[PDB]
Amino acid sequence: FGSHSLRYFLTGMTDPGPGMPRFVIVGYVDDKIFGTYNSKSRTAQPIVEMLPQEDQEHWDTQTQKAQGGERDFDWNLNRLPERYNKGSHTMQMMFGCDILEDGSIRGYDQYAFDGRDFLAFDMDTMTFTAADPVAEITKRRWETEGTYAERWKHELGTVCVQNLRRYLEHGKAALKRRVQPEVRVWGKEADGILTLSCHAHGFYPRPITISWMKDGMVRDQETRWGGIVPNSDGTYHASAAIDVLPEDGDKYWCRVEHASLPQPGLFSWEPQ
């Protein structure tokens, strides 16, 4: 089942660290950063490796919208700590939309204060849900206004979906290009135990599987997975390790499944 997603990750910080911006937005289409904003540059800009031929007009609009969000977050960090009778603080928002192959859409809009759920909006019912009785104050104030729900319905169900469709078309080359993993298996023995490690370098898209097998049988009970983690160029990394008897090193195989491979790859430890 095919679908695409647009997500914005907004963070405001009272204590971002030396020289770091207090407010940041990172935008993703599917598993790809398409653009960013921060409070130091005060500019929204595309990731050119995904969106190589953007018009300035669009990004002027994004910049002004982001500057508005920055102001909204500045007020949150001032006001919410007092309400919670609560050092440093953060405000976060995750919002966006999906478009699905079946013709439907979804909207998402969630907030967190100090890394804890605060509030959510449900596009379909146009209602807010609070995470706690302090957040309930915002929920009730916003809902009684009527306007917040109308505006967010528009933002998610009209604006977000228009922009997602735009970035899918503009970013087609990067989104559809498959980049194969470069897989290496290495072995290291210590204290009579050979640790086998399988690292998959530089794959795209993000979904990948890695399995260790011996005599055709997966050894999931013994496998340690490193997780899927990003490279700076939009590709990903993942890994799995297993501890084996040194004398058994030659009979273990690492299986890797990825959209760029026509069949699952198989890799073994080949010491000289």
Binding site: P16, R184, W186, V229, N231, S232
Partner: protein
């Protein structure tokens, strides 16, 4: 769920002695977002490091990628050193070179 950084270190490309590459450190799962992440070669900070814009996972915890161009040497030790207010002392994570 303790909000301390979870960290791993990895090269962009499969590593070979004397071949230019990029060293990555990815820290995730932490709160608050202020964090020091430093790539280290033989106990000396690596030059030219770049850091990702602050972002977070679906569980709200923060994450950051730091990377620096490097040419791996056998007989150097590479690491990522992380300082964070959940940690009593800086924590260090060794890069397994895979050669």
């Amino acid at each position: 769920a303790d909000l301390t950084p979870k960290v791993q270190v990895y090269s962009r490309f499969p590593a070979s002695a004397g071949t230019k590459n990029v060293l990555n450190c990815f820290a995730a799962g932490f709160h608050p977002p202020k964090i020091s992440i430093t790539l280290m070669k033989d106990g000396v900070p690596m030059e030219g490091a770049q850091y990702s814009d602050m972002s977070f996972n679906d569980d709200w915890t923060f994450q950051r990628l730091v990377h620096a161009d490097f040419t791996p040497s056998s007989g150097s030790t590479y690491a990522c050193k992380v300082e964070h207010e959940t940690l009593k002392e800086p924590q260090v994570y060794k890069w397994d070179p895979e050669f």
